[PDB]
């Protein structure tokens, strides 16, 4: 994964935008750096990870699960995370 990935400018689809609005200000275009941070903040604040197994996010009982299409995932699975995120946005140039 290149460092340039974080510079990608994106327009969230409605479900992603809904989630983002619960953790950050509503603007039209976000960087991937922004999207990752806000989704990360969402996971941390809502305690969707378990303190006894801190790499795994459980989202079966959360909007995030609908966003990503999985009951759980590992925060270490970066390629997978980017794919899950990408399906919820449009890239802009």
Ligand X SMILES: COc1ncc(-c2nc3c(n2C(C)C)[C@H](c2ccc(Cl)cc2)N(c2cc(Cl)cn(C)c2=O)C3=O)c(OC)n1
What residues make contact with Cl ion under the rule CB under 5 A?
A: 62-63
65 binds, among Cl ion, ligand X, none (CB under 5 to 8 A by kind): none
User: What is the layout of strands, in order, in the sheet containing 53-58?
Assistant: 49-50, 53-58, 72-74
Strand-pair partners of 89: 12
Sites of contact with ligand X (CB under 6 A): 36, 39-40, 43-44, 49, 54, 57, 75, 78, 81-82
The nearer residue to ligand X, 29 or 83, going by C-beta atoms, is: 83
Residue 39 touches which of ligand X, Cl ion, none (Cβ within 5-8 Å per kind):
ligand X
In the complex, residue closest to Cl ion by CB:
63
Residue the block writes with tokens 């197994």: 53
Phi, psi (rounded to 5 degrees) for 17: -55, -45
- Three-state SS for 19? helix
CB of 57 to ligand X, least distance (A): 5
């Amino acid at each position: 994964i290149p460092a340039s990935e974080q510079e990608t400018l994106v327009r969230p689809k409605p479900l992603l935008l809904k989630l983002l609005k619960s953790v950050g200000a509503q603007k039209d275009t976000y960087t991937m750096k922004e999207v990752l941070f806000y989704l990360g903040q969402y996971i941390m604040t809502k305690r969707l990870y378990d303190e006894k197994q801190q790499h795994i996010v459980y989202c079966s009982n959360d909007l995030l699960g609908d966003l990503f299409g999985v009951p759980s995932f590992s925060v270490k699975e970066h390629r997978k995370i980017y794919t899950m995120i990408y399906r919820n946005l449009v890239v802009v140039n």
